[PDB]
C-alpha cells in the first residue's frame, strides 16, 4: 500500500537520479543490433569505410557508456535502499521494544520477537532485489518496444497480438497438471499415513506375524497411485508441448510477415535482422519480468503483516523524599483480570526505614514490586511516591531514583565492569566502581577473575555463580544509589558473608538514614530486625508491626515464625 | 567426498531398472535439441533469400521446412518431458516400497530407539527428494551438453575464424567467474558472522527485557542494536558493490568479443565468404551458447550438493537387524509344554538394568498358570520373550525341548498367541481385524470366536454384520469393545499357548471364565497375568513376581 511509498519517500532525491540513469542505460545497450543491421545493409550497398569505422566507434562508445551508467545507477540505488532498510530495522526494533509489559507478560511469546525483525530483514532483502530487477526490465522492455515501434508498426502489431496467446495459454494449461499433482500428493500422503499406522504398532504386528500383509497393503496403495502418476505424466507432456510450440511458431510468423513486407518494399533486410534480434530480446525480457510478480506480491503481503505488528509523565524532582504510600492499591494481570494478585493493599515505607514482607509464595509480592517500579499500572487504587503518582514520574527519573534487584536477576551478556553499570547515562568513576564493588561484597568475586572487572561475562550468567550474580545485582543497585530500594531475593541463596553485607548495608550503612528500603525475601535473620514487618497473604494485609509485636499478636506472622 | 560418490553409485544402481525410459528420454531430448537449433539456420536462409532477387518457391519451401521442424521439435520436447516425469514417479514408488519392506524387518529395539514422526518425515519427504535427483540432473546435464555440441558444430559450419574468435572469450570468463565466486563466498561468511552478532543483542534483549526495564531504559539497548546494524550495512554494501563490478566486467567482456566478432564478420562480408543471414545466425548462436556452457560446469557442483539427502534413507535400509537366525522347525504336532530355566533378560535399549535374574518355571497343557504382583509393571517383559519378540540375555527358553528361536516365524505366532494390556485395532474392517494375521479364512470361522468372546451382541446390532468399518486405531469402539474384539482375535486362531493380560480386570469376569472354559483353554497351556489374587479361585499354579524375582 502507501506505507512502502511513504517509507521510500526519504530517498526520492536520489531515486529520481536512479531512474534517469536506468533509462539512459536502457537506451544505450540496444545499440548493438541496430548498428548490426545498418552496417550489414551498408556493406551490401557498397558503403564507404569512413561511414563504417565511425559507426563501429559509435556503437562501442554507446555500449560502454550504457554499461558504466548501469553500474553507477545500481550502486546508487543499492546505497539508498540499504540505508532505508537499516533505518526500517532500527525503527521496528525500537517499536517492538517500546511495547508495554502487558504485551510482553507472556514469556512463551519470546520466540516471535526473536523471529519477526529477522524476517523483516530478509523480507526487505528479497523485495530489494525483486524491485530492482522488475523495474530494470520494465524500462528495458518499454525501450525495446519503442524502437520496435520505430521499426515497423504493421509488423510489431503481430508480435504484440501474439504475446498474450503465448503467455496465457501455458497458464491455462498448467491448472490441469497442478490439480493432478495435488491429487497425487494427497494419495501419497494417505499411503504414507497407512504405512506409519502399520509402523507404530510393531509389537502386535510382530506378535501376529503380519509383515507380509502390511507390505501387500502398501503395494496395493502404490498400484492405486500409479494411474494418477500416468495421468500426471500425460498432462506434463501436453503442457511442455504447448509451451514450446507457442513460442516456437511465432518466430516463423514474424519472418513470414517480414518477407511479405520486404517483397512489398516497405522495409529492407537489415531492418528485418534488427527486428528479429529485438523481438528475441523483448521476448526474453517479458518472460523474465512475468516471473517476478508473485514474489513481489508475497513480499508485500508479508510486509502488510509486518507493519500491522508495527502498529501495535515528565516529573523530574531534584531530590527524593523516600516516601511510598498506597490508597486501595489493587492490581490485576492483563492475562487473568478475573483474579487480582492484590486487593486494596495498604503499606507505607517512610524514608530511613525497612519494611519486611512475610507471607505465602505467590500472594502478590511481585505485583507490589512491579507496581512500585511503575512497570504495570495497578487495577485499582493510587500509589503515591512522596505524595505523587508513580506513573506521573518520568521513566528515566524513576529508574534512576527507585531501583531494585528482581527475584531472578540476569547478568548482562557483556563485561563485568559494564554489566555492573548497565543503563547508566553517565559512566561511573573507577574509584566509584571499586567502592560500589567493595560495599556490596562483590569485590571478592570480581577480584577472582584473571582480567578483573573488565573480563567478559557470557550469556545467561554461564561464567558467573548464582551468589556472584546476586552480588553483582546488589552492587548495581548500590551503585545506582537509589533512595527507594526493593530488596527482592538479594541474598536468599547467597553466602553468609553476602547476607551479612546486605544486612549491614540495610541497617549500619551511612546512607540508610536517607534511603527507603522495602525487603521481600527469605532472610529470616533480617526479617526480625526490620523496623516494620508486615504480613501479607491473598493480596491482603493480615498483620503488621515489629517482630516481637507480631509474635505477641499471635497473627499469621507469629504462626509462620513458630 | 567418497560418501557422495558411493551414494550416487547406489542411486544409479537403484534406478537401473528404468533404463528403457531413460534411453527414450535421451533420444527425444536429442531430437528436440537438433530440431530446435535448425530454426536460426533457416532464418539465415530466409534472410539470404529475401536479399538480391526474389524467389517465391524457395521462400515457401524454407517457411514450410521451418514449420515442420518446429512442430517436430515441440512434439519431441513434450515426449521427453513426459518420459522424465513418469520415470521420476516410478523411481519414487519403487524406493518407497523398498524402504518400507526393509524397515518392516527390524527388531523391536530399533523402533523403541527411534521416533515414529522421524520415520514419517523420511518416508514422506526424503524418498521424493531422492527420486527427484536423477531425472532432473540427467536432463539438465544432457540438454546442456548436446546443446553445446550442436551449437558449436553449427558455428564451425558457418565460419571457423569467427568460431575461434568466440572460443578465445571463454577462459577469461571462466577465470573471472572463479575469482568473483571466491571473493563473494569470502564476504558472505563475514556477512553471516555479522548478522549472527546482530541477532545476539536482540536475543539478549528479548531474554532479559524485564531486567532491562527494571534498571535502565531501552535506548541503551536500542542504540547498541543500531551500531551493529551499521556494521552489517557496511558489509552488505561491500558485497553488492563487488557484484556490480563483476557484472560490469562480464558485460564489457561480452561487448568486447561482440564488437570484435562483428568486425571480423563484416570483413568476411567484403570477401564474399559469408552472407547476411549467416551473420545473423552466428549472432544468435553466440548469444545462446553462454548459459549452456556455464551450466555444463555448474552441474557437477550442483550434483554433490543435492545428493546429500539420500544418506538417511540408505542408512536406514542398510542397518543390519540384530535378530537371531530364522528358524526352520515346524512340527504339525505340539505338546504345548513350555518351561523357563534360569532366564535373565535386560532391555538392549537401556542395558545394565536387569529386570530378570535367573527366572525358572514350567507350564503344562492341562494345568493353568497365573502370575500376580505389579512387578513395577515388569510382567509385560516375560510375555514378550514368550512370543520370540526378544532374545534372552542369559539362559534359554524352550518349547517342546527345542529353543523357541528355532521355530518358523509365521507358525510359532500362529500357535502361541497373547492379548495385550491395551488392545490395538487397525483401520480396516471388523472382519479384517478379527482375522488379522490370517492369509485366508472362511467367514463363518469368524463370529464363532466373537460368540466365544461375548462380542456377538454388537455384531448383530451394528449394520452389515461383521463387514462394517471402524476408525483408525479404534474410534467408535469403547475399551470393553476393544478388549472383546482382541479376545476374539486371539481365540479365532485356535492357539496352543494363550497369554492373557488382565482380561477380567477391565471387562466382566464372566468373559474371562468363558475363555478359561473355552476350546483354547481345554487342552492348551494358558498363562494369565493379574494385579490381584482374585484369579486364584480358578488358578492351579500361582507365581508372584516382585523386584524381578520369583517366589
Author numbering:
A (entry chain A): 173 to 484, 492 to 741
B (entry chain B): 131 to 681
Please give the exact wording used by the authors of the publication that reports this structure.
Peptides destined for display are first delivered into the endoplasmic reticulum (ER) by the transporter associated with antigen processing (TAP). Each subunit has an N-terminal transmembrane domain (TMD0) that interacts with other components of the larger peptide-loading complex, a six-transmembrane helical domain (TMD) that forms the translocation pathway, and a nucleotide-binding domain (NBD) that hydrolyzes ATP. These structures show that TAP suspends peptides across its transmembrane cavity, anchoring their termini in two distal binding pockets primarily through their backbone atoms.
We determined the cryo-EM structures of TAP in the absence of peptide (apo) and presence of six different peptides between seven and 14 residues long. In the absence of b27, TAP hydrolyzed ATP at a specific turnover rate of 2 per minute. NBD separation is greatest in the apo structure (53 Å), and reduced in the presence of peptides to between 35 Å (for the 14-mer peptide) and 27 Å (for the 8-mer peptide). Comparison of the different structures of TAP reveals varying degrees of NBD separation, indicating that the two halves of the transporter can move relative to the central axis.
